[PDB]
Amino acid sequence: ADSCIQFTRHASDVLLNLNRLRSRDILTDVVIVVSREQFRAHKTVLMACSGLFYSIFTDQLKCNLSVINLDPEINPEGFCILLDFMYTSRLNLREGNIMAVMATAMYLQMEHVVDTCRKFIKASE
Amino acid sequence: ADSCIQFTRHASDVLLNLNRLRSRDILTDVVIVVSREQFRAHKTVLMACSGLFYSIFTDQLKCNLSVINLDPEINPEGFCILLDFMYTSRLNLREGNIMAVMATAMYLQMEHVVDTCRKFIKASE
Amino acid sequence: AWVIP
Amino acid sequence: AWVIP
Numbered sequence: 362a363d364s365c366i367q368f369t370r371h372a373s374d375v376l377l378n379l380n381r382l383r384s385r386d387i388l389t390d391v392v393i394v395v396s397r398e399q400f401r402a403h404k405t406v407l408m409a410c411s412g413l414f415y416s417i418f419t420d421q422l423k424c425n426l427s428v429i430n431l432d433p434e435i436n437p438e439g440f441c442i443l444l445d446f447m448y449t450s451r452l453n454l455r456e457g458n459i460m461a462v463m464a465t466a467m468y469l470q471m472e473h474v475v476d477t478c479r480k481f482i483k484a485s486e
Numbered sequence: 487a488d489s490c491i492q493f494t495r496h497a498s499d500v501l502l503n504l505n506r507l508r509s510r511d512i513l514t515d516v517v518i519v520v521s522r523e524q525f526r527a528h529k530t531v532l533m534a535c536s537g538l539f540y541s542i543f544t545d546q547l548k549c550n551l552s553v554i555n556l557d558p559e560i561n562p563e564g565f566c567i568l569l570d571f572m573y574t575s576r577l578n579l580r581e582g583n584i585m586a587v588m589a590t591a592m593y594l595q596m597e598h599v600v601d602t603c604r605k606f607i608k609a610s611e
Numbered sequence: 612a613w614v615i616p
Numbered sequence: 617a618w619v620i621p
């Protein structure tokens with residue numbers, strides 16, 4: 362119907378609660394391995410944020426895996442920053458991490474993050 | 487860190503993508519039964535929106551059930567409207583459904599929906 | 612909160 | 617979109 366009312370804060374409240382489930386390890390269903398580091402998460406949140414995870418978890422064989430190993434070139438801190446962004450909308454972008462964050466966002470197919478990294482890099486050159 | 491940047495549309499985009507997964511029946515992990523009707527959903531989204539589902543899916547026995555049966559007094563249309571609200575932030579509140587929506591929101595422990603129903607009812611009296 | 616979207 | 621939160 363076109364006569365709905367909308368609760369402005371609903372989407373951010375849902376995301377805040379999903380991050381609280383992640384913090385408490387409630388209903389996490391996959392472990393992402395990035396060389397020596399492991400990250401627990403919810404497949405649905407990963408798919409809703411990343412083109413790469415959407416492709417992985419819609420694959421008829423990979424959708425059933427409980428562990429996904431990322432390319433060894435991926436930086437664990439870069440992945441950690443992007444995982445936090447997925448769950449909070451907040452990106453901890455710093456001079457010391459921007460190259461790793463951009464490379465990880467390109468691999469994960471997160472276009473809006475790639476765009477802001479490119480802009481911040483261009484401003485410093 | 488307190489130096490993060492934030493992507494304003496991220497939370498609403500995540501919710502839009504979770505509703506697209508629900509529409510395509512991708513990674514739905516529970517069926518909610520409301521008398522003769524069945525509704526497929528994601529446990530994490532239900533828990534992030536409803537105090538009742540949070541209690542159910544954090545219970546050590548109920549967290550493993552693939553089917554949850556609601557109280558026979560719950561109206562399926564009222565539940566359908568609230569499930570759509572969980573996934574879109576949009577509430578299809580009408581004169582013909584407000585009593586069923588309010589009763590369902592009270593049962594599901596969705597306080598913001600209960601509050602707006604009470605306000606709309608008070609304005610019409 | 613609530614608004615007309 | 618990006619903003620300072």
Ligand SMILES: N#Cc1c(NCc2ccccc2)ccnc1Cl
Nearest residue numbers: 408409410411412415503506507
């Ligand atoms: N989940 C989800 C999702 C989604 N995720 C992000 C993404 C980005 C690029 C390519 C594919 C997917 C995108 C569109 N539609 C859905 Cl349903």
Ligand SMILES: N#Cc1c(NCc2ccccc2)ccnc1Cl
Nearest residue numbers: 378381382533534535536537540
């Ligand atoms: N998921 C989730 C969730 C959450 N859901 C909604 C809710 C409402 C009332 C009582 C309990 C829960 C609330 C708080 N903190 C988390 Cl992590």
Ligand SMILES: [Cl-]
Nearest residue numbers: 471472473474
């Ligand atoms: Cl993005």
Ligand SMILES: [Cl-]
Nearest residue numbers: 596597598599
């Ligand atoms: Cl609510």
